[PDB]
A paper describes a structure:
MurD catalyzes the addition of D-glutamic acid to UDP-MurNAc-L-Ala, generating the dipeptide moiety L-Ala-D-Glu in almost all bacterial species. From a structural point of view, Mur ligases are three-domain enzymes that share a very well conserved ATP-binding site that harbors the Gly-X-X-Gly-Lys-Thr/Ser motif and display notable structural similarities in terms of domain arrangement. The N-terminal domain is involved in the binding of the UDP-precursor, the central domain in the binding of ATP, and the C-terminal domain in the binding of the amino acid or dipeptide. Crystal structures of Mur ligases reveal that MurC, MurD and MurF display at least two distinct conformations, namely ‘open’ and ‘closed’, with the position of C-terminal domain dictating the nature of the conformation.
Intermediate Bound MurD was co-crystallized with UMA and AMP-PNP in order to further explore the dynamics of MurD upon ligand binding. During the process of structure solution, 423 residues were refined. Structural inspection of Intermediate Bound MurD revealed that Lys198 is not carbamoylated, contrary to all previously published structures of MurD complexed to UMA Previously, complex formation between MurD and UMA, UDP-N-acetylmuramoyl-L-alanyl-D-glutamic acid (UMAG), UMA-ADP, UMA-ADP-Mg2+ and UMA-ADP-Mn2+ locked MurD in a closed structure, which gave weight to the proposal that ligand binding was important for the movement of the C-terminal domain leading to closure. It appeared that it was not in a closed conformation. After superposition of Intermediate Bound MurD with open UMA-bound MurD, we confirmed that this new conformation of MurD is different from the previously described ones, which was quantified by the determination of the RMSD values of all of the superimposed structures, both for the whole protein and for distinct domains. In the Intermediate Bound MurD structure, the H-bond pattern of UMA binding is almost the same as in the closed structures of MurD and as in open UMA-bound MurD. ADP-binding residues also occupy the same orientations as in previously solved structures. When focusing on the interactions and position of Arg302 in Intermediate Bound MurD, we observed a novel H-bond pattern for Arg302. Intermediate Bound MurD displays some features of the closed conformation of MurD. The hinge loop is similar to the one in open conformation of MurD, but with an additional H-bond to Pro300 and ADP, thus dictating the C-terminal domain to take a position closer to central domain than open conformation of MurD. However, the C-terminal domain does not rotate to the closed conformation, because Arg302 is not H-bonded to Leu299 as it is the case in closed MurD.
Residue numbers in the entry: 1 to 221, 227 to 438
The structure:
């Protein structure tokens, strides 16, 4: 596209807004920038040449614009933006700017949970094939920074927020991995409005990769991945689990370094995207055998005396923990650590996994009582995670799992979920060896 002599206004001064400033300056277009916050985090980083307005939006700036570029952190529904829209001022985001310039195919990944896992893994499959792959987007490297004449494949993790402002994506392959209640402040009309944002990812996609077990991932009007069914699925038989693709065995899950049924379906989704993108199968399968997974994502920290200790500290929401529980095949007793800051979540969806004779809950942190209320008869409540671990550890037996998948933010007691996971891992080594 050509922005020569346009009046461009960028809203938001975080990573996105700055990558947009860089993008326009590199084309000799000088944008203006604003942010509703007085001192947004990217303010320091801004070139001195750039006019800026902080502490509020500048409506006269907005209304005089030829193009408004909106960071994903501000709602299109913002009264200032709907007024620009009503003035017929074009509004786009960074992903839109990106798709107009990109000269290599795009794999596009969205969904409530699993995005970074699946995005990373598709990158690893491309790397294993010797492809110059650009991985970025929501994962944390702003997409505009990936733009590179030598790049042969882009792999973009995309949020609902980014998809809302994007109209030219034509992905060689696109997925919604799953849809569970998230960011609901941004979606006052409820689960279907959140879902509808995500569904845009498929428009003009060459292959849609859908989740056979989650209807919400399907266009209302494909290739599928699934646990029991789908083009890409898992096949458990004679004591083994296999990846199946179009009815063929392609890999024994034992050859992967990932654990957890939902990580195996992530592996299937990634494989499906890589196949659609024309990556060689043999190298993609190879990436499945070498990929260790991201830290704190259902991450095995220790297997010893027939007990698996699993750090799923990144599970800060109900949907993540639910996926963890749903895929479990524990021979002995599950010891499940829950709690922290529940962010007013509804924990009911967890309860159906917590029946029968072989589950114990160890609930801690700010909202531990809400989590124990899931099933008080089998729940301990402590102040801290460490206390919970010192209660459960003397009880573990061969065949058991100890799972930290707390369904809650960690911010009431920890710096962040990573500290919580690292603390869990240290205790697990101490108490599990
Ligand atoms: C919330 C969001 O969409 N953030 C993504 C964004 O980061 P960036 O720093 O550009 O964020 P931003 O658009 O400035 O918004 C960040 C925060 O600033 C605030 N904000 C922004 C503009 C403004 O005028 N006033 C204001 O208060 C909003 O509260 C928002 O919460 O662009 C990055 C590159 O594409 C993403 O990695 C990053 O994902 C983070 C990890 C995230 O939390 N994403 C959400 C969507 C998620 O995964 O659930
Ligand atoms: N397909 C999935 N469904 C539900 N939860 C998942 C899935 N894949 C991973 N998770 C869990 O979700 C949390 C975040 O995983 P991650 O790959 O970082 O996703 P995201 O990038 O979408 O935040 C972790 O607890 C992880 O184990």
């Amino acid at each position: 596209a050509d922005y020569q002599g346009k009046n461009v206004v960028i809203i938001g001064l975080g990573l996105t807004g700055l990558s947009c400033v860089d993008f326009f300056l590199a084309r000799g277009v000088t944008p203006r920038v604003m942010d509703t916050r007085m001192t947004p985090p990217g303010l320091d980083k801004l070139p001195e040449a750039v006019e800026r307005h902080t502490g509020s939006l500048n409506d006269e700036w907005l209304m005089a614009a030829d193009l408004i570029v909106a960071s994903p952190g501000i709602a299109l529904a913002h009264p200032s933006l709907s007024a620009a829209a009503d003035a017929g001022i074009e509004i786009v985001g960074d992903i839109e700017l990106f798709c107009r310039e990109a000269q290599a195919p795009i794999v596009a990944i969205t969904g409530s949970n699993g995005k970074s896992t699946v995005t990373t893994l598709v990158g690893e499959m491309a790397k294993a094939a010797g492809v110059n792959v650009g991985v970025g987007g929501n994962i944390g490297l702003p997409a505009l920074m990936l733009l590179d004449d030598e790049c042969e494949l882009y792999v973009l993790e995309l949020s609902s927020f980014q998809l809302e402002t994007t109209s030219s994506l034509q992905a060689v392959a696109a997925t919604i991995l799953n849809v569970t209640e998230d960011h609901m402040d941004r979606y006052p009309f409820g689960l279907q409005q959140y879902r509808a944002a995500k569904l845009r990812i498929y428009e003009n996609a060459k292959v849609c990769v859908v989740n056979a077990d989650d209807a919400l991932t399907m266009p209302i009007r494909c290739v599928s991945f699934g646990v029991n069914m789908g083009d890409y699925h898992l096949n458990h038989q004679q004591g083994e689990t296999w990846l199946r693709v179009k009815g063929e065995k392609v890999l024994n899950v034992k050859e992967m370094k990932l654990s957890g049924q939902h990580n195996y379906t992530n592996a299937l989704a990634a494989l499906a995207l890589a196949d659609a993108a024309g990556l060689p199968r043999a190298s993609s399968l190879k990436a499945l055998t070498t990929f260790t997974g991201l830290p704190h994502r259902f991450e095995v920290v220790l297997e010893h005396n027939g007990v698996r200790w699993i750090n799923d500290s990144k599970a800060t929401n109900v949907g993540s923990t639910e996926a963890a529980l749903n895929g479990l095949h524990v021979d002995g007793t599950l010891h499940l650590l829950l709690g922290g800051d529940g962010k007013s979540a509804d924990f009911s969806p967890l309860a159906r996994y917590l029946n029968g004779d072989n589950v114990r809950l160890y609930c801690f942190g700010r909202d531990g009582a809400q989590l124990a209320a899931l099933r008080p008869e089998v729940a301990e409540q402590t102040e801290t995670m460490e206390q919970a671990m010192r209660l459960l550890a003397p009880r573990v037996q061969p065949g058991d799992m100890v799972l930290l998948s707390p369904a809650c933010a960690s911010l009431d007691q920890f710096k962040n979920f990573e500290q919580r996971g690292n603390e869990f891992a240290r205790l697990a080594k101490e108490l599990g060896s």
